[PDB]
Amino acid sequence: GARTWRFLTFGLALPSVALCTLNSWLHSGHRERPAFIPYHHLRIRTKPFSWGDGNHTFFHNPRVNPLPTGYE
Amino acid sequence: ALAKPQMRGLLARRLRFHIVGAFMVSLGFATFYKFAVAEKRKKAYADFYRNYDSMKDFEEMRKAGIFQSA
Amino acid sequence: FENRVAEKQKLFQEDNGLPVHLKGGATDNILYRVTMTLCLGGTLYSLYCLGWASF
Amino acid sequence: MAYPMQLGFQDATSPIMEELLHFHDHTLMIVFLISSLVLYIISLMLTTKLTHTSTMDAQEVETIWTILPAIILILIALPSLRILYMMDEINNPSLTVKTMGHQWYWSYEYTDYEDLSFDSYMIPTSELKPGELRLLEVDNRVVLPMEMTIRMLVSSEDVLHSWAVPSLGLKTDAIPGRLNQTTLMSSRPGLYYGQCSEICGSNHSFMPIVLELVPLKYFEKWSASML
Amino acid sequence: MFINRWLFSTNHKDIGTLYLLFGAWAGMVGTALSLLIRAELGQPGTLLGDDQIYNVVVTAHAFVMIFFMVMPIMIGGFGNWLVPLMIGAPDMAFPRMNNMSFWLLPPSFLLLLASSMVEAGAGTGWTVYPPLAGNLAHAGASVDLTIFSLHLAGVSSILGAINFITTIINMKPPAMSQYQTPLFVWSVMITAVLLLLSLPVLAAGITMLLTDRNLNTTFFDPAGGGDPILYQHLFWFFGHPEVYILILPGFGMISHIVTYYSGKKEPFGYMGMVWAMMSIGFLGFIVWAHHMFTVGMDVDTRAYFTSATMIIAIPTGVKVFSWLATLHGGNIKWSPAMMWALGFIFLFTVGGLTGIVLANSSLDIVLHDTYYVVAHFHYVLSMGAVFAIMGGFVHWFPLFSGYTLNDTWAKIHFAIMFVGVNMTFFPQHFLGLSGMPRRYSDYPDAYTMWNTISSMGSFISLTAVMLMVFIIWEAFASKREVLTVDLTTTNLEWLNGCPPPYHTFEEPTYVNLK
Amino acid sequence: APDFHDKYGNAVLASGATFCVAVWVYMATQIGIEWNPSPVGRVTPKEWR
Amino acid sequence: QTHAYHMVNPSPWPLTGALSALLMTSGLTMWFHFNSMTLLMIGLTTNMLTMYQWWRDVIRESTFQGHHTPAVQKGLRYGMILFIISEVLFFTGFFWAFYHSSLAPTPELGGCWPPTGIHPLNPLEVPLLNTSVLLASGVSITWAHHSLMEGDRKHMLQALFITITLGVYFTLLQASEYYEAPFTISDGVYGSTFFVATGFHGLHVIIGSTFLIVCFFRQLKFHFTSNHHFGFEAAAWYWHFVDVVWLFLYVSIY
Amino acid sequence: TDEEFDARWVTYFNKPDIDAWELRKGMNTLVGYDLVPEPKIIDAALRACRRLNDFASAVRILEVVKDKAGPHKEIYPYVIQELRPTLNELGISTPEELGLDK
Amino acid sequence: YQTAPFDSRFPNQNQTRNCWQNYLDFHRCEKAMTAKGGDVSVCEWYRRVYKSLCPISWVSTWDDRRAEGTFPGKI
Amino acid sequence: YEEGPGKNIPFSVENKWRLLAMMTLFFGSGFAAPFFIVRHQLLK
Amino acid sequence: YALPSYVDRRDYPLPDVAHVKNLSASQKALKEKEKASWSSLSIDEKVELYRLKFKESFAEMNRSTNEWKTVVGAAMFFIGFTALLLIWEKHYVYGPIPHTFEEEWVAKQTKRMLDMKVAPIQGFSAKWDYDKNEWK
Amino acid sequence: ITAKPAKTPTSPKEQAIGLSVTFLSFLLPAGWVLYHLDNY
Amino acid sequence: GGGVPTDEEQATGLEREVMLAARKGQDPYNILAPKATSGTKEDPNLVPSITNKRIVGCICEEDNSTVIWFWLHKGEAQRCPSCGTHYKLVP
């Protein structure tokens, strides 16, 4: 019944989400900017993107995403 | 007085005989291909190579001017 | 909130010969017109872009 | 090469293509067996005033209509798979040659010892010497030793191509980033022609392959002279 | 009333009629393209220009004939018209969604036309393989427009597949089991299952191609660790089932036509015909890599695909033998539709058998990417799918229109087409065996005689197509209204007259369970 | 009561056949189509080098 | 009529939907090649309008007009199942792409997986939270379904609200994960397979959350009965599909 | 067996109050089989026609006997010979005698 | 040395990995030998095999990348 | 809606010559389209 | 369209309705007479009874036709017409073929093909006699 | 199938016109373009 | 808590007609297959209709795949043209 699934929702499901939330917020912060190496299989540009200046990914994050020529 | 002929199963009887014939004709036709074409081809390759001299074949080609390398 | 389904059943079952997409009333006709006008006008614009792009 | 009004395969130049000619004859005989059976039976069904239109019992034929075709498929698959596996058996070649596909020409590399390579373009029709073959001749042929097992490795530097030589039973796709192998063995000297066999753009029709098969001595001589 | 009727339809018959008109218009475009191919090849040399314009034409030919002529006519046209009638249903399950499956096709066709009008067109082959179809070797909009064309046609067919499967499973009379539905209904259901499973995989693959072209993905690009061969697997995972989708409804119509013109109440071996179509549908998903025997796959893989592909001959043979056994003992009526069906049985067999030749990977080395493949597939398409279309169209035109055709004209049409298609394609076997590659705008001089003859056959086929237009006009011009149709007791689609009223089976059939 | 085919059949058949043959032979032989037939038994080889 | 099926009123929505498809696709083409988004925006707008009116009409036909007899309902069940099956096979293609690349890494990658230079997300960090979030939403929607069947308005609404909140949470978490990731869609086939597969899945989360929201508003307006609520069942089946796809992604692609 | 099949069909046509629907159903069923019906079946069918006052159907029944024989030209003359007493007694003319074979 | 022998690790039509592995082994072998004052000329077997098998442009591109610090193979 | 022969179609068959004109525009436009695109392209 | 109807079909010899539904004066009289001995009916009366029930006889419904002549002849006309299109194409669409089709080029090319022994086992050079320097 | 006589019989002349117009609708536009290829 | 309407309370139009007729063991919208009688002339299958004719399909023998279809008219009972079972229209 509904009572069982409500029990599961408040006893198992939401507490699990709460613990994972707590653990992600605590252990978030900001870690290492990876050192840049201009590997030819990464930062692929075969055609400019259709937004921005053509060279920035859609969720480009200046802190951790280098351009083909390196970090900004 | 006319004698009683067979009146039942005439289509089935025609098929029983003609199916055997279909198989014979179709096997004959396929086997004729095998004979006229495949057996002829086996013999033509075995005969061509039986005493084939690759170097003589080469020299003749060379002499006629066909090669870049010789 | 209150259950007003009975009112909506009476409205949508009114014997006025309207097809279902217009049976809500005047607001339906407006939303229909806007929809069809954007579709047809946009289709015209798309043929325009093709003409331009073809050369 | 092909000749006018030709009906079947180009004559075999390699043992493997000989096998394929026989296997094709064997399979085409079966094609003729079945297609003649069907036309004969069609014709039989359509040539009688006798009738039987009530329901017919279908279970009587269940067996022969599936078992005899199964047996015929076996008769095809057995030699088919024998040839498949024979062709795959361990190759010990004496020579490795690479070819790279390009828009629209082939390059060849013979790098077992020396770094020999060159490009091979189609001879334009306006530049053919008397008696030379329209769309087939190249400037620099692929010179190879006859009567030797040769490993040909095939790739591309741009789009797909496919490296084919019908008379030797060869067709290997030229895929950028991949190195595909085939083996080649000619029973005879001569000139053996193929054509690009994957759609590759403007001049797909116009980037042929010419193998020139000669005794080892002349291959070595040519090798050294093309360095 | 015209806009309401023909643009806002929720009626299975009118939607069927729209599909038949669309498909007949597409067939003219595809015939023009076929003539352009054969005009280029009809004498040695260059007629139109280089391989780019030529393969734009070849690629468009294929897309038009497959996605805009065959599929809309068989599934949209005959499926919509006949399926509801054959199970006594009042319409399709989703009669409004059905109209969108129709209306997606003119825009899909407009996209393809746009692809050929911009830049230098999409000269890729209907397979659209990268890297030729990528953004460096086909820079610009053409390939993208082609992809979008396929997405729309894909959505149209997916939605249509959901509609047909739901209709066929849910809307029969309550006493009727699935094994008391006619064979065309089965063929449509099975085709719909194949579409439902296969088109989403195509959609994924062409979406990857779109992202490689525009979002800097590298699914198919070695530089990023991608692989052009991946695209081939995804394409042919769809593409093999696609050819079964093209032929299955034609199998269904052939069973009906053969039965009817043999004077029979039922096809021979109904259960075997159902089993055979289900077997073919299943086997059609486990054979795709016979399109890839020269790409460099492992030997055991090549053995498996050779073997599995040949197995398809067994259930297919059951259907051929069952059609012959339907003829057996018939009161044979040599109608034009009967002629199409007999030509189908024989010529489809020939095409099937050259497919069995090609199933052999070792031999396929030498046949792959030659005209032998082109000969195989045109026997099963131009002399198979198309013969079933023509048969069905002549047979059911009186049901759909209420008018009869001139049977003598229809027989003349058949005879000319028969000569034309055989003259076009039979010599292509020789061109293939002797080494003529696919997708070539010109050929070495040796290949001239067979190319010449082949082109001459294409012109005869043109004459047949032109004549068919005239024959349809003459029927509508003369207005011979149908009077009696025989064998209605086992052909339910006819029982509401010619044409049937807009609404049929408002009162459903009475069938008891006993 | 004789039908279309009783009246016009033999005429359509004879004329059609005659027209078809005449026009195809003319097309094949009189307008410069190069069929490129086999050289075998037809062409005399000539020096090329 | 003396059958139980639904003869639908003639409708413009099929045509507007088909034209919306034309405008979205020609609009993407104009965006990718001619640097303009106008056509695309008009297509998205007409697509949204068509979806709104078409599904509005299905509610009119069912809740308000009574056309969903058991036989019509049974057909909608089949149609939703079949639609889901087609979506599963769409995703299968991306799984195939992922395995093709990852099980045979090419020399350009360093001949290894993950590729040289790629730092994968740790699946025991935000992706585990994502997993808990969608699993919990599968539990809540099940509570919502049982509450509906038992006739319990308040608990249905509460359960359904929780389910939607969780889908929105997933979407926000995934947007953040996308922003924080040190690799991009342009980081070769690693980036391609990861973002396109998870991206289509995120699209489906959005779609399913939207469908649940429609259900929420319909439940607020008393449309559903304790025995007749197929829009809700269809949204729950779609949501379970969204959950199962995530679980495969989690296990496979991370 | 053949004899049991024959006797059922004779019995069918012999039903004194056989109606017109039943006579037609009988004959139309029978001609679907791979056989020319035995004289005693046709005899019984002809006499049903007489009880049903249907001369035309009697003629038609003789035509369908000839038709079912196909290229086996000895079967019709034979059945006619065997039927002559019934033909004479009921005044049933053959299709040939009526010119209906031209 | 005439050409690269059959290698049972690479028995298939796709020879990509055979070229790759031998290019890697040449450089791995040189590093390990030179580190232990060992005989570096032993590694010549690998150089001969990769030179036979690998396209010139692949060897050239990988060489360039090693010089650049962007070669993705582990050596 | 109109029912019966000539009435269940989106085109009129009232007059056979107007029908001929409509059928000819219909089919002839589809046949002609590829030729006109070839023209279009060669003129670039 | 929903009513039982008439057909002439040799496997349905007794159709669902008579050929003539509505009978004149004398036709009803003839039907009444059919109730008495049939020996008392004339040949004409018997034929008339037959033609009230049935439309065509077996012989008539099974007749041969000359349609095959019209079909074959007309097909051949249309096939002939096609050759006119080909002639038109040859004159107005096609330009010159390549120079490699000139007779001298072919003579040269043929010699070179024999010198390289093109298809020497069966297909081409096999048909040339190298000893006698002629075609076999 | 059986049918009523033609409501609006199409005489041989009328068929010759219909056939000619049909064939010309295909042949003239294509022929025009094919003739003029060189000019393009 | 309650608050969710029932079908009894809120079902409408044809859904409601079907539900109400089912409670009374009636099938005006043909959801169920009609049970056969012995099908003799004395005991024909009674075929309801809202007009003066309805199509019958007769599955003559169970697991026949072929169904025999015909128009049943108002008036004298008619017979399946394959098995002869009797049907009578009740308009």
Ligand code: HEA
């Ligand atoms: C259904 C599919 C189909 C059909 C019918 C055809 C029909 C024809 N095709 Fe084919 N063709 C393909 C699909 C088809 N083709 C595909 C898939 C390819 C490969 C593409 C690639 O390589 O990428 C191809 C490639 C191809 C080539 C090879 C190009 C190359 O490799 O360079 C050639 C060459 O002659 C050719 C010619 C023709 C000709 C002369 C016809 C003629 O037989 C056409 C004649 C006309 C008809 C058969 C009737 C048309 C139908 C109607 C008018 C509808 C009528 C409507 C109603 C009754 C409702 N086609």
Ligand code: HEA
């Ligand atoms: C309607 C379309 C259709 C159909 C139904 C088929 C059916 C079959 N096809 Fe074909 N095919 C195509 C259309 C179709 N094909 C196209 C379009 C391509 C090219 C794609 C491209 O590259 O563009 C192609 C390519 C193609 C290839 C790839 C070749 C290459 O590219 O190198 C192969 C290889 O196995 C193949 C095989 C078969 C087989 C075995 C069948 C079987 O289903 C045939 C089974 C039928 C029979 C065998 C006949 C009936 C049987 C009997 C009478 C019983 C007895 C028979 C035996 C015992 C043998 N087809």
Ligand SMILES: CCCCCCCCCCOCCO[C@H]1O[C@H](CO)[C@@H](O)[C@H](O)[C@@H]1O
């Ligand atoms: C079939 C229909 C598919 C619909 C596709 C919709 C895609 C809409 C994308 C809109 O993207 C706009 C560009 O946004 C990108 O570039 C902008 C700078 O130019 C940034 O401000 C944004 O943050 C983002 O990185």
Ligand SMILES: CCCCCCCCCCOCCO[C@H]1O[C@H](CO)[C@@H](O)[C@H](O)[C@@H]1O
């Ligand atoms: C719906 C399908 C419609 C199909 C229409 C097909 C007609 C296609 C004509 C395609 O034109 C391609 C462009 O070709 C021209 O430009 C190319 C590139 O510069 C050249 O390589 C060619 O020789 C050609 O001159």
Ligand SMILES: CCCCCCCCCCOCCO[C@H]1O[C@H](CO)[C@@H](O)[C@H](O)[C@@H]1O
């Ligand atoms: C479930 C899958 C996730 C999909 C979530 C999509 C909804 C989130 C949309 C947010 O889009 C914006 C990305 O924007 C960020 O980076 C962009 C580029 O540097 C910037 O222009 C923006 O200002 C922003 O900083």
Ligand code: CUA
């Ligand atoms: Cu290179 Cu085709």
Ligand SMILES: [O-][O-]
């Ligand atoms: O695909 O055959």
Ligand SMILES: [Cu+2]
């Ligand atoms: Cu296939």
Ligand SMILES: [Mg+2]
């Ligand atoms: Mg290929």
Ligand code: NA
């Ligand atoms: Na050409």
Ligand code: NA
């Ligand atoms: Na429920």
Ligand SMILES: [Zn+2]
């Ligand atoms: Zn019955």
